[PDB]
Amino acid sequence: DDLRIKEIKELLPPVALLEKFPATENAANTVAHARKAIHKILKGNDDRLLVVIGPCSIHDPVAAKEYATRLLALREELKDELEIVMRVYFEKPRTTVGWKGLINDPHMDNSFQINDGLRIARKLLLDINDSGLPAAGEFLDMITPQYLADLMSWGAIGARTTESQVHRELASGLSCPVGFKNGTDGTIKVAIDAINAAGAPHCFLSVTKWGHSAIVNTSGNGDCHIILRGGKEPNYSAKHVAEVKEGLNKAGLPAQVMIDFSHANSSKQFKKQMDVCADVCQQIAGGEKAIIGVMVESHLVEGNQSLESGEPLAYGKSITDACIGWEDTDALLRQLANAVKARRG
Amino acid sequence: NDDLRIKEIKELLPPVALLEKFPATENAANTVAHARKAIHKILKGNDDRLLVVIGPCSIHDPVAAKEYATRLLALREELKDELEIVMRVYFEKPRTTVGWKGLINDPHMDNSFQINDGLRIARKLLLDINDSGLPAAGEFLDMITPQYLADLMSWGAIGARTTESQVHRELASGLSCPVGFKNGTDGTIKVAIDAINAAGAPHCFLSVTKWGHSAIVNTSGNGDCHIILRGGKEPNYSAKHVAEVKEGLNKAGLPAQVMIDFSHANSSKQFKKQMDVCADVCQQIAGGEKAIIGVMVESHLVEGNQSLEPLAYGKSITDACIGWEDTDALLRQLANAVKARRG
Amino acid sequence: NDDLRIKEIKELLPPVALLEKFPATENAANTVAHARKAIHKILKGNDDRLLVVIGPCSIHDPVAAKEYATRLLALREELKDELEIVMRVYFEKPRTGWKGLINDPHMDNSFQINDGLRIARKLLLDINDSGLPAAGEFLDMITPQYLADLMSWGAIGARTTESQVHRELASGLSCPVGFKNGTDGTIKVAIDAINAAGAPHCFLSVTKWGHSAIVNTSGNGDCHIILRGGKEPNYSAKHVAEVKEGLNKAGLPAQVMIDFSHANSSKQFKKQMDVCADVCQQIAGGEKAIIGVMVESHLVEGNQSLLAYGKSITDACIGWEDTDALLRQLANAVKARRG
Amino acid sequence: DDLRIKEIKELLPPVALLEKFPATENAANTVAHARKAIHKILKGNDDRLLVVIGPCSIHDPVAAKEYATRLLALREELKDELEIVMRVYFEKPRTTVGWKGLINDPHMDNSFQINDGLRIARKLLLDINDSGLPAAGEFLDMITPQYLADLMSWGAIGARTTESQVHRELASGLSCPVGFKNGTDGTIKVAIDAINAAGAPHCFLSVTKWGHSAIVNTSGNGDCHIILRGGKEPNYSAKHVAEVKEGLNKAGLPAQVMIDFSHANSSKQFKKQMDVCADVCQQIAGGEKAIIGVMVESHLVEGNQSLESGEPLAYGKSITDACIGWEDTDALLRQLANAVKARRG
Numbered sequence A, D: 001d002d003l004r005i006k007e008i009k010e011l012l013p014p015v016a017l018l019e020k021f022p023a024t025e026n027a028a029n030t031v032a033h034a035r036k037a038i039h040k041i042l043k044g045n046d047d048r049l050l051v052v053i054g055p056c057s058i059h060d061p062v063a064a065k066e067y068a069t070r071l072l073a074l075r076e077e078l079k080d081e082l083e084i085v086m087r088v089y090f091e092k093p094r095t096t097v098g099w100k101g102l103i104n105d106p107h108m109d110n111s112f113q114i115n116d117g118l119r120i121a122r123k124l125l126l127d128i129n130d131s132g133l134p135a136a137g138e139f140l141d142m143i144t145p146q147y148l149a150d151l152m153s154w155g156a157i158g159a160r161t162t163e164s165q166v167h168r169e170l171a172s173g174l175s176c177p178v179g180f181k182n183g184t185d186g187t188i189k190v191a192i193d194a195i196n197a198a199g200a201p202h203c204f205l206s207v208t209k210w211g212h213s214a215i216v217n218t219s220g221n222g223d224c225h226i227i228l229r230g231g232k233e234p235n236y237s238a239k240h241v242a243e244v245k246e247g248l249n250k251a252g253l254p255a256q257v258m259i260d261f262s263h264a265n266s267s268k269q270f271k272k273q274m275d276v277c278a279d280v281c282q283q284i285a286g287g288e289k290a291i292i293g294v295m296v297e298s299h300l301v302e303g304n305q306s307l308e309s310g311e312p313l314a315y316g317k318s319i320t321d322a323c324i325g326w327e328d329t330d331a332l333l334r335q336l337a338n339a340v341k342a343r344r345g
Numbered sequence B: 001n002d003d004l005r006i007k008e009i010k011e012l013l014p015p016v017a018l019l020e021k022f023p024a025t026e027n028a029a030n031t032v033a034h035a036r037k038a039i040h041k042i043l044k045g046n047d048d049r050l051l052v053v054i055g056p057c058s059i060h061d062p063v064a065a066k067e068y069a070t071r072l073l074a075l076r077e078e079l080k081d082e083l084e085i086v087m088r089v090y091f092e093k094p095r096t097t098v099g100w101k102g103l104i105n106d107p108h109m110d111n112s113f114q115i116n117d118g119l120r121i122a123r124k125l126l127l128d129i130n131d132s133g134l135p136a137a138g139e140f141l142d143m144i145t146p147q148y149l150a151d152l153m154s155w156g157a158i159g160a161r162t163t164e165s166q167v168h169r170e171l172a173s174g175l176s177c178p179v180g181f182k183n184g185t186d187g188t189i190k191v192a193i194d195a196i197n198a199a200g201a202p203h204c205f206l207s208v209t210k211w212g213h214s215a216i217v218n219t220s221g222n223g224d225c226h227i228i229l230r231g232g233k234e235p236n237y238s239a240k241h242v243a244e245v246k247e248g249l250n251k252a253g254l255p256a257q258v259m260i261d262f263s264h265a266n267s268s269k270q271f272k273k274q275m276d277v278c279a280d281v282c283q284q285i286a287g288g289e290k291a292i293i294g295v296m297v298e299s300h301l302v303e304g305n306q307s308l309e310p311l312a313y314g315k316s317i318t319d320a321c322i323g324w325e326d327t328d329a330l331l332r333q334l335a336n337a338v339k340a341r342r343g
Numbered sequence C: 001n002d003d004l005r006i007k008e009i010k011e012l013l014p015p016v017a018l019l020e021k022f023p024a025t026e027n028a029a030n031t032v033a034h035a036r037k038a039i040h041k042i043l044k045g046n047d048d049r050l051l052v053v054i055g056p057c058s059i060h061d062p063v064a065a066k067e068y069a070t071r072l073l074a075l076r077e078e079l080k081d082e083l084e085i086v087m088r089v090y091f092e093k094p095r096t097g098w099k100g101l102i103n104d105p106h107m108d109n110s111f112q113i114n115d116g117l118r119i120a121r122k123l124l125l126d127i128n129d130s131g132l133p134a135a136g137e138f139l140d141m142i143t144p145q146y147l148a149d150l151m152s153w154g155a156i157g158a159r160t161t162e163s164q165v166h167r168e169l170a171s172g173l174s175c176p177v178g179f180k181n182g183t184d185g186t187i188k189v190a191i192d193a194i195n196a197a198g199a200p201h202c203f204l205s206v207t208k209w210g211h212s213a214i215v216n217t218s219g220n221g222d223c224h225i226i227l228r229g230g231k232e233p234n235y236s237a238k239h240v241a242e243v244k245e246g247l248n249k250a251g252l253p254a255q256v257m258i259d260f261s262h263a264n265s266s267k268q269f270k271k272q273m274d275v276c277a278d279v280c281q282q283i284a285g286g287e288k289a290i291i292g293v294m295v296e297s298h299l300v301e302g303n304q305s306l307l308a309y310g311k312s313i314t315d316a317c318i319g320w321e322d323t324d325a326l327l328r329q330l331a332n333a334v335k336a337r338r339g
């Protein structure tokens, strides 16, 4: 047995990270209030827009904290219209070879220093929540969340695993609202199945805070919604939104969507997120109540850059997918806030 | 801000406990080692026989399963020159939404989730089957269960709904057995091709050890992986589709070899039509198609299925299967097609 | 500033793995459950029979041990109206040499502890399954999780009677526990131990899952003294009366177990037969405070160094003929004491 | 199983406490230097006296830190003569039953909040070492050492466990020097056997920093020595010291002793530690080289007090054995330093 398993190394149990970086009272309040605010929006009891916005992935805690400071100030100013949550993702999932993210490779040197990465990742989440800014995460696996989910106010399940039973089980026990992405061809069937599955109670094997496998029972997660992220062609338009609202009603689910402005929805050209924003704002200002959230890939400095062995990097600029910069980000957030005003007034 | 949707947490026996209680016998270990070697030889293109993965959609009754195994073992022996027969022993079921997830998750089928019981039952059965001399195949859905059973598995499948899944591709990369990847539920071949490439590469990721502890594990990569055609919007078992897949495989620099699942979307969810698929596939094989190295059939003692009162004997409680009579005949057809292809 | 003096760390099977591989049969579970009950009644003073723990100094050979167990079981059934016969199944001889069956089951200094645990639990299981209860010695706080469920009685090591961690262990054991008196023959430490082990405790221990945890115990009211001599033997009627007075003064039931071996026998194995005659006289004469004895016995008498069969490789024991005689003598004393 | 086991509760693994409270550079320096200093003394390459001195038990971090400040000042002033290490004892062996100490029951109300106790104990040990003051402990429990041993410069195995094989095994793998007390009846042989046992490599069952049981192999610890703590009568006097030196040499060990001024050497009368001090000082000034260490029970305020009365505790005063107060401690330390200087002269 174990002929294709080469070596096994020690992993800090979640409780070690929880003890080292405990939620402050401010941090816990940030998380509790944002989860509640998002629930309220999902129930239709609040007409504000959930905005999940931030870097494609975090490679530098310094830049991430400056970004947080900037975003926090807009969160405060636009709070009457928007529930602003910072995107704090640690990995860009990909087919090709490349950087495995901040948890796996925090020192960006193609080694795996996961114990280091988990420390760095938790400490960043802690600092951001502690400043008053809520965080959104992505769940790619079953083990990472035990280290980090207590600091997450919203989460997405990876696009390649919306159909996976193990990832749906995960969602059904998460303490935060959860977004499920539509199919790569832009169909919503798999995401609807995922929402149903996740809303149900489940019993399954998982790793506990003590780093031991155990049998776990979940209550089911009713705060799960679809994320529209395009198929071949984009799917943010008033037409596609109507199609999805129809499918959702037909399935017995609340007719609400989050729209991902990036990638397929913007033809993989970062500046085009501004065109998606313009269209989406039009729908909202017109009277669309079903768009309950959006997601935008945004950083201090626009564009992206490629990681290169022994060379320094531009500050505040993505090393994964290209993002809009701060200037566009400020304009975009203001457009959405104004759109939310216009909708009700 | 923790544990609000976690209702209860209960003790789980570690793999090492199941391994100690139910160690592989000499025979069990022999069966596994030979079958893995034999499938490898088939995948390398150095043996012209056909890998046949056949058995129930799911195991729910160890007794019926042991009878089934007794019968199949005879045919495995009789047809050994044409077919490498391996029994489906699926303890885990991916649901489209919700439902019974299999023997391990709920051995008593009453939503009591006696998983410790399920693990003991499943290992005992697997051990017994291998000990008689019949190799076993299972779907690896769960990230934590494989440590309790894998040493007794001769071949594994990653389901259509998890072929795109990073963690499952990592799992495959560390499995000691050959692994098949089903095409996507919409019929997409690319995802499985990416899966094969990913699983052949070494990985480093979080997993659970034999002692039940989470750890960082490094895998070597698994070169014995292949695609499983299982249809999409329409069936994809025909020579036309096979031609396309072989082409797609070559482009990706992979060996042009397929396994064909006769059931699911390929039979339009109608169990009888597996006989039709069999007819068509035997044609391609008899006609000279060497790229078809394997098939997968959903088979039980009694055909059809039932809903989960006590239950009817020998009948699937999940997907509908063909009965034993059709099974014996299906297998003989396949062996004859292999006869034809050779000489 | 860690692990300078730690050379190597190797994986240890958790107790659940040995519990799962070697579960108690119905017969084994009944043997343990009944012998514990019986011993309790003797200690409570509601049964006039005598507990007899008897067997090899240490087990090095499972085959010879199972042969001994078979012979003893016959005498156990025969003398059951007078005697509660329990086999001594000790896997190590504490000393300042061979590290015992659990540490070195292959007798070659290779420390195959996972093997030793399997062999020890298997042996214990077979003995209990046949109907013969077993007595163990608890030298550490981890070993018991693997074997304690197949033990109807246990002794705390002489060297650890004073130790708070071993007293804590005793307070949570399911079986009755014996505490040896002091090397100088005094009983103060053993009286402290019994009082400590009788109270509930909270302390860190390792679970059946092989993880450390916080454990709370109820306290063990089934602890008693074991007289094993000091500078001089302390088995005489004089000494028993002294010990009884101290127990009474300390508000403890005035009862003792007497070890026939070692210091009480001046380190000569046949002298165990002398202690037997002395103890028998006391019992037959009407001494009710003697509730048990401990005897070092094998198939073949004497000992040897590191190989003859069924002969001790540690301290010397009486052989099987003396053992038959010794057990009958005791049974006869109990008849005389009773009617 | 489980018949006399009432409850089993989760325990933080040592890695959790090490991650939450890692050694600072200065704390690590304090430990490294003190261990090296003690080793040099025990090898006979330094003529200074090891002095282990402090409370019978710690029950209050605040008084403990005030005490440490005062002791550190004298450590600095007297360091040419004395290697001063503070008694930081978190575990207490009871004759029968009683409060087992801060780790076992930090809130002193039989709530047994051991997780709290461990956090409190490590943090205190860290603070003391960081200030520059090395710490000594008693190693009683088989599981607790992993939580604290990295911050200990010296350890003792109590009189009631000197004969215990698992304690000798523990010592054989400890990274610090270790004193073994003579028997509670005054027997010397058990401690000599302990020293020899501890010097040898062992293989035995223990618990790792992950809180898992395992098989460990140790190398043996050559930095062990005897502690003279009295018997039925005290054994600190010259006559007794000569007997012990001879016994040690006979067993092939260097003739060296630490003398505990308290417990049976003071007939459990706390002020008699000053009389023991006078006699031991005369021995040392007279030219006795074998006395390499002493141990003294000392607190801010002399005497002791009872937990069970339910009266609010007086500050800086022992709730276990009675100690000398600060003013006597200062005097006693100066006497010892003067004696060491005379010995050298």
Ligand SMILES: O=C(O)/C(C[C@@H](O)[C@H](O)[C@H](O)COP(=O)(O)O)=N/O
Pocket (backbone or CB within 6 Å): B057, B090, B093, B094, B095, B096, B097, B098, B099, B139, B159, B160, B264, B318, B319
């Ligand atoms: O075993 C296989 O080869 C499978 C998995 C398949 O059997 C699935 O578990 C059920 O079809 C669930 O059915 P439902 O759609 O009722 O959840 N192929 O897809």
Ligand SMILES: O=C(O)/C(C[C@@H](O)[C@H](O)[C@H](O)COP(=O)(O)O)=N/O
Pocket (backbone or CB within 6 Å): D056, D089, D092, D093, D094, D095, D096, D097, D098, D138, D158, D159, D263, D321
């Ligand atoms: O700290 C030491 O150096 C010790 C241990 C000692 O302090 C013990 O814990 C109490 O004297 C027991 O007190 P009691 O007899 O009240 O349980 N030396 O023996």
Ligand SMILES: OC[C@H]1O[C@@H](O)[C@H](O)[C@@H](O)[C@H]1O
Pocket (backbone or CB within 6 Å): A091, A100, A103, A104, A140, A141, A144, B166, B167, B170, B204, B205, B206
């Ligand atoms: O963050 C840790 C995770 O990293 C992912 O990239 C990997 O696929 C997972 O298996 C897990 O190791």
Ligand SMILES: OC[C@H]1O[C@@H](O)[C@H](O)[C@@H](O)[C@H]1O
Pocket (backbone or CB within 6 Å): D065, D127
């Ligand atoms: O490290 C800074 C220190 O500050 C002190 O005031 C406190 O008593 C210590 O516990 C520690 O926190």
Ligand SMILES: OC[C@H]1O[C@@H](O)[C@H](O)[C@@H](O)[C@H]1O
Pocket (backbone or CB within 6 Å): C092, C099, C102, C103, C139, C140, C143, D165, D166, D169, D203, D204, D205
């Ligand atoms: O049975 C295993 C035990 O063996 C003892 O000899 C040893 O002192 C204990 O620590 C433990 O290892």
